[PDB]
Design an enzyme around this catalytic site. Structure first.
Site, PDB file in Angstrom:
ATOM      1  N   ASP A  15      -2.070  15.927  51.376  1.00 22.04           N
ATOM      2  CA  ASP A  15      -0.692  16.125  51.882  1.00 22.04           C
ATOM      3  C   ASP A  15      -0.529  17.293  52.833  1.00 22.04           C
ATOM      4  O   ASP A  15       0.616  17.672  53.163  1.00 22.04           O
ATOM      5  CB  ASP A  15       0.341  16.184  50.728  1.00 22.04           C
ATOM      6  CG  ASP A  15       0.097  17.290  49.757  1.00 22.04           C
ATOM      7  OD1 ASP A  15      -0.609  18.273  50.172  1.00 22.04           O
ATOM      8  OD2 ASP A  15       0.605  17.227  48.603  1.00 22.04           O
ATOM      9  N   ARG A  29       2.840  20.343  56.005  1.00 18.39           N
ATOM     10  CA  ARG A  29       2.947  19.811  54.673  1.00 18.39           C
ATOM     11  C   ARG A  29       3.854  18.588  54.728  1.00 18.39           C
ATOM     12  O   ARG A  29       4.917  18.631  55.255  1.00 18.39           O
ATOM     13  CB  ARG A  29       3.509  20.894  53.729  1.00 18.39           C
ATOM     14  CG  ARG A  29       3.771  20.462  52.286  1.00 18.39           C
ATOM     15  CD  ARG A  29       2.574  19.955  51.563  1.00 18.39           C
ATOM     16  NE  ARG A  29       2.773  19.879  50.128  1.00 18.39           N
ATOM     17  CZ  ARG A  29       3.285  18.844  49.498  1.00 18.39           C
ATOM     18  NH1 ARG A  29       3.669  17.785  50.160  1.00 18.39           N
ATOM     19  NH2 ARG A  29       3.398  18.867  48.198  1.00 18.39           N
ATOM     20  N   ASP A  34       3.619  14.395  46.916  1.00 19.63           N
ATOM     21  CA  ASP A  34       2.657  15.305  46.278  1.00 19.63           C
ATOM     22  C   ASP A  34       1.414  14.554  46.009  1.00 19.63           C
ATOM     23  O   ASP A  34       1.422  13.630  45.174  1.00 19.63           O
ATOM     24  CB  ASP A  34       3.223  15.864  44.950  1.00 19.63           C
ATOM     25  CG  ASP A  34       2.456  17.111  44.448  1.00 19.63           C
ATOM     26  OD1 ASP A  34       1.819  17.825  45.270  1.00 19.63           O
ATOM     27  OD2 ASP A  34       2.561  17.312  43.205  1.00 19.63           O
ATOM     28  N   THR A  35       0.363  14.939  46.706  1.00 17.68           N
ATOM     29  CA  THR A  35      -0.934  14.400  46.358  1.00 17.68           C
ATOM     30  C   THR A  35      -1.605  15.300  45.341  1.00 17.68           C
ATOM     31  O   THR A  35      -1.333  16.457  45.288  1.00 17.68           O
ATOM     32  CB  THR A  35      -1.827  14.258  47.602  1.00 17.68           C
ATOM     33  OG1 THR A  35      -1.899  15.477  48.337  1.00 17.68           O
ATOM     34  CG2 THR A  35      -1.332  13.138  48.536  1.00 17.68           C
ATOM     35  N   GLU A  37      -4.449  17.807  43.965  1.00 19.75           N
ATOM     36  CA  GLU A  37      -5.282  18.805  44.642  1.00 19.75           C
ATOM     37  C   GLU A  37      -6.686  18.226  44.627  1.00 19.75           C
ATOM     38  O   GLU A  37      -6.985  17.337  43.811  1.00 19.75           O
ATOM     39  CB  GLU A  37      -5.227  20.171  43.937  1.00 19.75           C
ATOM     40  CG  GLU A  37      -3.830  20.785  43.826  1.00 19.75           C
ATOM     41  CD  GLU A  37      -3.220  21.145  45.190  1.00 19.75           C
ATOM     42  OE1 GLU A  37      -4.010  21.532  46.068  1.00 19.75           O
ATOM     43  OE2 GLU A  37      -1.974  21.042  45.378  1.00 19.75           O
ATOM     44  N   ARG A  75       4.200  26.656  56.540  1.00 20.27           N
ATOM     45  CA  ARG A  75       3.833  25.281  56.845  1.00 20.27           C
ATOM     46  C   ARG A  75       5.003  24.521  57.421  1.00 20.27           C
ATOM     47  O   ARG A  75       6.104  24.564  56.899  1.00 20.27           O
ATOM     48  CB  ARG A  75       3.260  24.572  55.574  1.00 20.27           C
ATOM     49  CG  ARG A  75       2.207  25.322  54.901  1.00 20.27           C
ATOM     50  CD  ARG A  75       1.591  24.599  53.695  1.00 20.27           C
ATOM     51  NE  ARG A  75       2.589  24.494  52.642  1.00 20.27           N
ATOM     52  CZ  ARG A  75       2.418  23.936  51.472  1.00 20.27           C
ATOM     53  NH1 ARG A  75       1.219  23.484  51.087  1.00 20.27           N
ATOM     54  NH2 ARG A  75       3.448  23.805  50.651  1.00 20.27           N
TER      55      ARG A  75
HETATM   56  C1  THP Z   1       6.839  19.662  50.119  1.00 21.72           C
HETATM   57  C2  THP Z   1       7.544  21.006  50.014  1.00 21.72           C
HETATM   58  C3  THP Z   1       6.922  22.035  49.370  1.00 21.72           C
HETATM   59  N1  THP Z   1       7.536  23.274  49.303  1.00 21.72           N
HETATM   60  C4  THP Z   1       6.940  24.398  48.503  1.00 21.72           C
HETATM   61  C5  THP Z   1       7.410  24.195  47.041  1.00 21.72           C
HETATM   62  C6  THP Z   1       6.151  24.613  46.210  1.00 21.72           C
HETATM   63  O1  THP Z   1       6.225  26.059  45.989  1.00 21.72           O
HETATM   64  P1  THP Z   1       5.141  26.689  44.987  1.00 21.72           P
HETATM   65  O2  THP Z   1       3.810  27.008  45.819  1.00 21.72           O
HETATM   66  O3  THP Z   1       5.798  28.045  44.508  1.00 21.72           O
HETATM   67  O4  THP Z   1       4.806  25.809  43.844  1.00 21.72           O
HETATM   68  C7  THP Z   1       4.939  24.236  47.137  1.00 21.72           C
HETATM   69  C8  THP Z   1       4.187  22.938  46.718  1.00 21.72           C
HETATM   70  O5  THP Z   1       3.299  22.629  47.842  1.00 21.72           O
HETATM   71  P2  THP Z   1       1.874  22.147  47.413  1.00 21.72           P
HETATM   72  O6  THP Z   1       2.061  20.808  46.603  1.00 21.72           O
HETATM   73  O7  THP Z   1       1.193  21.956  48.744  1.00 21.72           O
HETATM   74  O8  THP Z   1       1.207  23.190  46.457  1.00 21.72           O
HETATM   75  O9  THP Z   1       5.531  24.242  48.447  1.00 21.72           O
HETATM   76  C9  THP Z   1       8.750  23.447  49.888  1.00 21.72           C
HETATM   77  O10 THP Z   1       9.329  24.526  49.711  1.00 21.72           O
HETATM   78  N2  THP Z   1       9.383  22.467  50.535  1.00 21.72           N
HETATM   79  C10 THP Z   1       8.808  21.218  50.656  1.00 21.72           C
HETATM   80  O11 THP Z   1       9.389  20.316  51.175  1.00 21.72           O
HETATM   81 CA    CA Z   2      -0.319  18.842  46.495  1.00 24.64          CA
END
Ligand code: THP
Ligand code: CA
Length: 129
Positions: A15, A29, A34-35, A37, A75
């Site tokens: 993702d 992103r 959510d893929t 890890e 991102r």
């Molecule tokens: C997809 C997405 C993720 N995020 C943030 C929330 C999560 O914060 P946290 O890192 O504190 O958990 C993280 C999850 O991305 P990842 O699934 O790439 O880890 O990215 C956003 O804020 N907005 C979005 O639309």
């Molecule tokens: Ca992920």
């Protein structure tokens, strides 16, 4: 929403992908998904699926939603298209991502994606197997 041009710099995982957008390298992103890890079950398969889709594309496009365009990590938050096909949707439809991270005001394609998820789940694909 509007599609804008980008070019692939590098596949990263299921993702996230590194693209050049307005001439600047950015990690993107994928919105509303959510893929797993890479370390996790179906992680490697999701990474491979996105990598093939973006590397084989003649034309990458990104589409920002109405809300936040960058997350707290810098991102880019977008829907990504490979030769017109949405990567975000394709992952969900194949059972390689869950619909997730559905924030108010950046959720234009939510119902499209939830329909793909229902179909993946009916077929018991991958994550739903
Ligand atoms: C997809 C997405 C993720 N995020 C943030 C929330 C999560 O914060 P946290 O890192 O504190 O958990 C993280 C999850 O991305 P990842 O699934 O790439 O880890 O990215 C956003 O804020 N907005 C979005 O639309
Ligand atoms: Ca992920």
């Amino acid at each position: 929403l509007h599609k804008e041009p980008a070019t692939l710099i590098k596949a990263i995982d299921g993702d996230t992908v590194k693209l050049m957008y307005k001439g600047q390298p950015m990690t993107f992103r994928l919105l509303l998904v959510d893929t797993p890890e890479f370390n996790e079950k179906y992680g490697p398969e999701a990474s491979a699926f996105t990598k093939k889709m973006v590397e084989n594309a003649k034309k990458i496009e990104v589409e920002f939603d109405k809300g936040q365009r960058t997350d707290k990590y810098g991102r880019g938050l977008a829907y990504a298209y490979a030769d017109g096909k949405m990567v975000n949707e394709a992952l969900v439809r194949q059972g390689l991502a869950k619909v997730a991270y559905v924030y108010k005001g950046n959720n234009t394609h939510e119902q499209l994606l939830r329909k793909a998820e229902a179909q993946a789940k009916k077929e018991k694909l991958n994550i739903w197997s």
